[PDB]
């Protein structure tokens, strides 16, 4: 019932009580662990609503008060009649901050309480969506001093009337399939990039082409829009000691802003809810640049360092990997754009976990995702046992709209 | 029910039916994943089911399932249990047994070698001094003058749990650590307590930064006994760097043979509480964990100082830079001295190949991602990108409490 988690580096032990408030399923059984798997009505709505309002009135310290009881009935009476209900602004902010608090795969939650929430529930069209997105991008970019933000479009109704941002992020680079068999740009976005050319985008067909936004209002055909270029802050990638680095021609955008997720608060489903913070260095250095199936620039870099690529055991991939990541951190900082290195991100996440243990009774955390994809064991999160569980409100993945939407 | 795992780099999907043959619990529930928790005397009743299962396995694999010789062995194990409360494994069964304990070992990235294990049967051993002698032969044979060979040495199974063979050392070769009275620690900090025990049992400690520990051996439930391993048997590699000449002045070395001596080997219900096994090292085990963990030799700072890195801001990635050099030095030193070692790239690649094969030939490969992915350069090794299913098959290697914690002292 109570569970202890030990840090095997500091011997510090914490007791988890928060997992018993967990509702949804993990994918794991007594017989099988599924921790490394990337993805494992009116009758239904009212309990969900009640469970959420109960934690909301508790957090504001008015559990079981007349204000509590009255909102509880008001929501019940709106469900029986309208087959859905509306959140109050205050409940919406709480909902969203907490969906971030509960994101077990996010290393950056020490920040959770300072989320800026933009309520876009009065939006009705794709142009309106575009306007909200641009105000989001600009607010959160803040000339390089980035701020956490989420913009919340109207909730799902019959399911035929969904708002959706088809992009997986607001700002991403195009992917094109070429005559050779090679890929130009970002291979992760090839399918989406084709969906842009078939909606009518003029692709410049380079390596770092900022994709257009494809916006869906109230279930309608989606629509193309270019983000004003002046709003997409980008950093050219150079190295502090290696002068040749600049001619690789690398740049990355400043703003990571996830836009394909679904926000569930008290049974209500917000299918367009883009949110953004700022990068941990390794996300770009290790994953975007180095993954075999992304930009995969490791061979090129190691060749420019004049390292021995004859045998795997020179650790030349490892040597290059560090420099590539040195250069991302250096470039961002020298341009005064917010970024965090993996040592700092994880040290901070450990502070946060210790905070959540004494102040909430626990902290759901998915180790497989928290441990950075380089230098695992030299970060303190490597030695830290974590319990993974699913709390609500939450962010969830959702089918890609193009498989699903009807034209 | 069939379960699919995806490789997110190659988009290869594989199908696991083997998980269906799993009986032990994982520590996980529908409501909670404990995949990163380090650790989450039998009666006659329980024993025959386990015996039967195992012997069914054994005989399936030799293609003799349901043969006269299979039924006759079942009946014979049956009788032996009801009459003696335990049973003896045939030699061939034990070999098969120990090989599968490896093959089922889901935290081991080194299973591609699983069949080529050399089994030493020390089940006639009755005394500590007998145990020293079997262990010495293990080590010499396994060391092979640097051309390491995997091997395990199986001492007599548990009987009533009052007569256990234990190897008190966590590994056969390991360095003393000594808590000084100023809170500092000389040698290996992981081995402090056990070192103290050795000292209590009469070991006269040199007190250097790398003193090979003495074997502490328990036979047949008896109080355990000290023995120095012959130093000519302990292969060690001094650590240098191919380009940094100052590296050798750090005074580092490591032993060449990793030999785990604290696990329990379970086969068809029988428990072997002393079963040291050994392989060869993946470079990162020494380089990342043994030298660079804060709770071990902790040399990152000393190494960064000497490279004159920018140590004033963690954003220089001075730690990441120092770590790669140290790992380079470990691999270089081993290769140059002709002692077997594998780098993490080549090991993880081998393991992906094994895993794929195991799905085609066995219908599964239980693997634990938290353990399989190396503690440096995770995502540039192909395992990071591989979905894995973790489950418990028997035969298996299990953990067991440390003996100083359970052992009944006699004087
Ligand atoms: C402000 C600094 C932030 C940092 C450094 C950060 C970092 C990360 C990292 C490293 C991941 C792992 C995913 C990967 O590497 O592919 C992640 C996932 C995630 N982040 Fe955070 N994040 C930040 C802000 C936010 C905000 C503001 C939200 C929402 C309010 C958020 C929600 C999530 C969610 C839901 C996931 C899981 C994504 C998935 O399951 O695919 N993050 N984040
Ligand atoms: C020969 C080359 C081998 C290599 C490179 C290798 C590699 C590894 C590594 C890197 C680990 C993770 C342990 C850690 O990092 O703390 C491990 C664990 C393990 N290995 Fe292997 N191994 C090899 C051979 C063997 C042999 C001979 C056996 C047994 C007969 C074996 C069985 C195991 C088991 C049972 C574990 C689980 C350890 C634990 O849970 O603490 N492997 N191995
Ligand atoms: C808001 C925020 C800040 C920061 N720093 N970082 C983030 C994570 C995103 C950035 N960099 C990757 C990650 N993206 C989140 C979405 N993950 C895709 C995993 C995936 C792929 C395919 C199929 C699946 F089912 C799942 C968010
Ligand atoms: C046979 C073989 C070959 C290789 N290369 N490598 C190995 C693993 C050992 C060497 N490098 C470290 C590792 N360790 C052996 C297993 N014990 C640690 C697990 C553990 C720790 C604390 C509490 C627990 F409950 C469990 C075995
Ligand atoms: C197979 C495995 O689940 C998959 O590669 C995961 C591993 N850990 C990860 N961790 C983070 N932070 N991001 C990822 O995309 C992944 N991918
Ligand atoms: C808490 C966490 O599971 C623990 O520190 C584990 C993580 N993965 C590991 N993986 C290996 N190979 N060896 C280890 O000691 C550990 N430690
Ligand atoms: Zn699990």
A273 close to A151: Cβ distance less than 8 angstroms: yes
Angle of helix B300-307 relative to helix B318-336, nearest 10 degrees, comes to 100
A182 close to A176: Cβ distance less than 8 angstroms: no
Does B124-149+164-235+399-403 carry CATH code 3.90.440.10? yes
Atom 9 (ligand 6): residue with closest C-alpha?
Answer: B371
Fold of B236-258+281-346: 3.90.1230
Which of the listed residues A35, A108, A114 should we mutate to test ligand 1's pocket, taking the one with most ligand atoms within 8 A of CB? A108
Q: Is A280 in the pocket of ligand 3 (CB under 6 A)?
A: yes
d(CA B256, CA B278): 10
A274 close to A165: Cβ distance less than 8 angstroms: yes
Q: Is A115 in the pocket of ligand 3 (CB under 6 A)?
A: no
Q: In the CATH scheme, what is the code of domain A234-256+279-344?
A: 3.90.1230.10
The alpha carbon of residue B82 is apart from the nearest alpha carbon of chain A, in Å, by 31
* Cβ–Cβ gap B327/A318 under 8 Å: yes
Q: What end-to-end distance do the CA atoms of chain B give, in Å?
A: 56
Return the residue in A241, A315, A338, A380 with the most chain B beta carbons within 10 A, the one to mutate for interface testing: A315
Query: A149 - beta bridge partners?
Result: A116, A276
Which residue of A lies nearest to B388 if distances are taken between CA atoms? Answer: A36
d(CA A347, CA A384): 11
String of b and e for B339-351 (b: at least 16 CB within 10 Å)?
bbbbbbbbbbbbb
Q: Which long-range CB contacts under 8 A does B54-58 form with residues at least 24 apart?
A: B54/B93, B54/B97, B54/B267, B54/B268, B54/B269, B54/B394, B54/B395, B55/B93, B55/B268, B57/B100, B58/B93, B58/B96, B58/B97
Atom 13 (ligand 6): residue with closest C-alpha?
Answer: B371
Q: Give the DSSP H or E segment for A350.
A: helix A342-359
A173 assigned binding-site residue: no
Give the residue numbers of B annotated as catalytic, written as ranges.
108, 111, 280, 285
Q: Specify the pairing of strand B177-179 against strand B185-187.
A: antiparallel
Q: If you count residue pairs, one on A and one on B, with CB atoms under 8 Å apart, how many are there?
A: 205
d(CA B48, CA B275): 23
Question: In A179-288, where do the E strands start and end?
Answer: 183-185, 213-216, 223-225, 234-236, 251-253, 257-258, 262-265, 268-270, 275-276, 279-280
**HSE value, Cβ hemisphere, 13 Å, CA-based, for A283:** 20
List, as residue ranges, the binding site of B: 36, 108, 171, 280-281, 285, 370-371, 384, 399
Kindly report the number of other CB atoms within 10 A of residue B125's CB atom: 23
Q: Which of A86, A400, A407, A367 is nearest to A262 (CA)?
A: A400
Task: Tell me the CA–centroid distance for residue B242 and ligand 3, in Å.
Answer: 39
CATH architecture of A122-147+162-233+397-401: Alpha-Beta Complex (3.90)
d(CA B228, CA B248): 27
Which residues approach ligand 4 with their CB closer than 6 A? B 38-39, 110, 258, 260, 277-282, 285, 399
Question: From the list B3, B38, B324, which residue is nearest A315 (CB)?
Answer: B324
d(CA B327, CA B254): 13
CATH architecture of B16-123+150-160+264-278+348-372: Alpha-Beta Complex (3.90)
Question: From the list A312, A373, A385, which residue is nearest B384 (CB)?
Answer: A373
String of b and e for B192-215 (b: at least 16 CB within 10 Å)?
eebbbbbeeeebeeeeebbbbbbb
A319 vs B contacts (CB less than 8 Å) = 324, 328
Q: Which of A7, A5, A3 is nearest to A380 (CA)?
A: A7
* Cβ–Cβ gap A34/B33 under 8 Å: yes
Task: Tell me the CA–centroid distance for residue A161 and ligand 4, in Å.
Answer: 55
A150 close to A167: Cβ distance less than 8 angstroms: no
Task: Tell me the CA–centroid distance for residue A38 and ligand 5, in Å.
Answer: 7
Calculate ∠ Cα A344-A346-A348, nearest 5°.
70
Which of the listed residues B27, B95, B110, B153 should we mutate to test ligand 2's pocket, taking the one with most ligand atoms within 8 A of CB? B110
A278 assigned binding-site residue: yes
Question: From the list B9, B19, B314, which residue is nearest A31 (CB)?
Answer: B19
Which of the listed residues B102, B285, B350 should we mutate to test ligand 4's pocket, taking the one with most ligand atoms within 8 A of CB? B285
Q: What end-to-end distance do the CA atoms of chain A give, in Å?
A: 50
d(CA A166, CA A150): 16
Atom 20 (ligand 2): residue with closest C-alpha?
Answer: B108
Which residue of B lies nearest to A325 if distances are taken between CA atoms? Answer: B317
Q: Give the DSSP H or E segment for A396.
A: strand A394-396
d(CA B277, CA B117): 9
Q: Is A293 in the pocket of ligand 3 (CB under 6 A)?
A: no
Method: X-ray
Cβ neighbours of residue B312 closer than 8 Å, sequence gap 6 or more = none
d(CA B194, CA A9): 18
Rg (CA), chain B: 23
d(CA A322, CA B340): 27
d(CA B295, CA B373): 20
Q: Which of A289, A340, A9, A106 is nearest to B317 (CA)?
A: A340
Q: Which of B224, B344, B239 is nearest to B297 (CA)?
A: B239
Number of helical H runs and strand E runs in chain A: 12, 18
Query: A394 - beta bridge partners?
Result: A264
Does A16-121+148-158+262-276+346-370 carry CATH code 3.60.10.10? no
Q: Is A383 in the pocket of ligand 6 (CB under 6 A)?
A: yes
d(CA B344, CA A306): 22
For A280, phi then psi, to 5°, come to -90, 140
Return left, alpha or beta for B230; rule: phi > 0 is left, psi -120 to 50 is alpha, else beta.
Answer: beta
d(CA B147, CA B339): 6
**Domain segments of chain A as ranges:** 16-121+148-158+262-276+346-370, 122-147+162-233+397-401, 234-256+279-344
Q: Which long-range CB contacts under 8 A does B11-16 form with residues at least 24 apart?
A: B12/B356, B14/B356, B14/B359, B15/B359, B15/B363, B16/B359, B16/B363, B16/B364, B16/B365, B16/B389
Task: Tell me the CA–centroid distance for residue A38 and ligand 4, in Å.
Answer: 27
Q: Tell me the three state secondary structure of residue A245.
A: helix
Query: B179 - beta bridge partners?
Result: B185
Q: Is A112 in the pocket of ligand 1 (CB under 6 A)?
A: no
Atom 17 (ligand 1): residue with closest C-alpha?
Answer: A106
Atom 38 (ligand 2): residue with closest C-alpha?
Answer: B107
Q: Is A395 in the pocket of ligand 1 (CB under 6 A)?
A: yes
d(CA B194, CA B404): 9
Cβ neighbours of residue B142 closer than 8 Å, sequence gap 6 or more = B118, B148, B149, B150, B151, B257, B259, B278
Atom 23 (ligand 2): residue with closest C-alpha?
Answer: B110
Query: Cα torsion for B161, B165, B166, B171, to the nearest 10°?
Result: -140
Task: Tell me the CA–centroid distance for residue A36 and ligand 7, in Å.
Answer: 8
Q: Which of B305, B287, B309, B306 is nearest to B296 (CA)?
A: B287
Q: Is A262 in the pocket of ligand 1 (CB under 6 A)?
A: no
A285 close to A324: Cβ distance less than 8 angstroms: yes
Which residue of A lies nearest to B349 if distances are taken between CA atoms? Answer: A312
Q: Which of A3, A23, A15, A17 is nearest to A389 (CA)?
A: A23
B2 vs A contacts (CB less than 8 Å) = none
B177 close to B186: Cβ distance less than 8 angstroms: yes
Which residue of A lies nearest to B325 if distances are taken between CA atoms? Answer: A319
User: What is the 3-state secondary structure of chain B?
Assistant: CCEEEEECCCCCEEEECHHHHCCCCCCCECCEECCCCCCCCCCHHHHHHHHHHHHHHHHHHCCCCCCHHHHHHHHHHHHHHHHHCCCCCCHHHHHHHHHHHHHCCCCCCCHHHCCCCEEEECCCCCCHHHHHHHHHHHHHHHHHHHCCCCEEEECCCCCCCCCCCEECCCECCCECEEECCCCCEEECHHHHHHHHHHHHCCCCCCCCCCCECCEEEECCCCCCEEECCCHHHCCEEECCCCCCCCHHHHCCEEECCCEECCCEEEECCEEECCCCEECCEEHHHHHHHHHHCCCCCCCHHHHHHHHCCCCCCHHHCHHHHHHHHHHHHHHHHHHHCCCCEECHHHHHHHHHHHHHHHHHHCCCCCCCHHHHCCCCCHHHCCCCCECCCECCCCCEEECCCCHHHHCCCCC
Cβ neighbours of residue A22 closer than 8 Å, sequence gap 6 or more = A364, A389, A390, A391, B31, B32
List, as residue ranges, the binding site of B for heme b: 108, 399
Q: Specify the pairing of strand A213-216 against strand A164-165.
A: antiparallel
Rg (CA), chain A: 23
């Amino acid at each position: 019932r109570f569970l202890k988690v030990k840090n095997w580096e500091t011997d510090v032990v914490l007791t988890d009580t928060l997992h018993l408030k967990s509702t949804l399923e993990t994918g794991c059984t007594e017989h099988i662990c599924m921790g490394s798997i990337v993805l494992p009505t009116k009758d239904q709505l009212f309990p969900l609503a009640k469970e959420f309002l109960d934690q909301y009135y508790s957090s504001i310290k008015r559990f079981g008060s007349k204000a509590h009881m009255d909102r509880l009935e008001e929501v019940n009476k709106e469900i029986e009649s309208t087959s859905t209900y509306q959140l109050k602004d205050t409940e919406l902010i709480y909902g969203a901050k907490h969906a971030w608090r509960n994101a077990s795969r996010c290393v950056g939650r020490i920040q959770w309480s300072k989320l800026q929430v933009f309520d876009a529930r009065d939006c009705t069209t794709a142009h309106g969506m575009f306007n909200y997105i641009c105000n989001h991008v600009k607010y959160a970019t803040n000339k390089g001093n980035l701020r956490s933000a989420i913009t919340i479009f109207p909730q799902r109704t019959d399911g035929k009337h969904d708002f959706r941002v088809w992009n997986s992020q607001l700002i991403r680079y195009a992917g094109y399939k070429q005559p050779d068999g090679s890929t130009l740009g970002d291979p992760a976005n090839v399918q989406f990039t084709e969906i842009c050319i078939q909606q009518g985008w003029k692709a410049p067909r380079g390596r770092f082409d900022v994709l257009p936004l494809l916006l869906q209002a109230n279930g309608n055909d989606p629509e193309l829009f270019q983000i004003p270029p002046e709003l997409v802050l980008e950093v050219p990638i150079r190295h502090p000691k290696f002068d040749w680095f600049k001619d690789l021609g690398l740049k990355w955008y400043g703003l990571p802003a996830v836009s394909n997720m679904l926000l569930e608060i008290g049974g209500l489903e917000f299918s367009a809810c883009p949110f953004s913070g700022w990068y941990m260095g390794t996300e770009i250095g290790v994953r975007n640049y180095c993954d075999n199936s992304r930009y995969n620039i490791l061979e090129e870099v190691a060749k420019k360092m004049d390292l021995d690529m004859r045998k795997t055991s020179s650790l030349w991939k490892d040597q290059a990997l560090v420099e590539i990541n040195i250069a991302v951190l250096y470039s961002f900082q020298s341009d005064k754009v917010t970024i965090v290195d993996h040592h700092s991100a994880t040290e901070s996440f450990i502070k946060h976990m210790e905070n959540e243990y004494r102040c909430r009774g626990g902290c759901p955390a998915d180790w497989v995702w928290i441990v950075p994809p380089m230098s695992g064991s030299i970060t303190p999160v490597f030695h830290q046992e974590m319990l993974n569980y699913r709390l609500t409100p939450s962010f969830e993945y959702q089918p890609d709209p193009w498989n699903t939407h009807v034209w």
